[PDB]
């Protein structure tokens, strides 16, 4: 099910500095 993380994680990591202090 890890395929779900890389889905929302990869998007945030590329976001360019997503809020929440969670640097994907």
UniProtKB/Swiss-Prot annotation:
Residues 1-24 are cytoplasmic. Predominantly expressed in monocytes and granulocytes. Expressed in neutrophils (at protein level). A motif (GFFKR motif) lies at residues 3-7. It is found in: Cell membrane; Membrane raft. The integrin I-domain (insert) is a VWFA domain. Integrins with I-domains do not undergo protease cleavage. Heterodimer of an alpha and a beta subunit. ITGAM associates with ITGB2. Found in a complex with CD177 and ITGB2/CD18. Interacts with JAM3. Interacts with THBD. Interacts with complement factor H/CFH; this interaction mediates adhesion of neutrophils to pathogens leading to pathogen clearance. Interacts with TMEM268; this interaction inhibits ITGAM degradation via the endosome-lysosome pathway. Belongs to the integrin alpha chain family. Integrin ITGAM/ITGB2 is implicated in various adhesive interactions of monocytes, macrophages and granulocytes as well as in mediating the uptake of complement-coated particles and pathogens. It is identical with CR-3, the receptor for the iC3b fragment of the third complement component. It probably recognizes the R-G-D peptide in C3b. Integrin ITGAM/ITGB2 is also a receptor for fibrinogen, factor X and ICAM1. It recognizes P1 and P2 peptides of fibrinogen gamma chain. Regulates neutrophil migration. It is linked to Systemic lupus erythematosus 6: A chronic, relapsing, inflammatory, and often febrile multisystemic disorder of connective tissue, characterized principally by involvement of the skin, joints, kidneys and serosal membranes. It is of unknown etiology, but is thought to represent a failure of the regulatory mechanisms of the autoimmune system. The disease is marked by a wide range of system dysfunctions, an elevated erythrocyte sedimentation rate, and the formation of LE cells in the blood or bone marrow. This is Integrin alpha-M. The gene is ITGAM. The chain holds residues 1129 to 1152 of 1152 of the full protein.
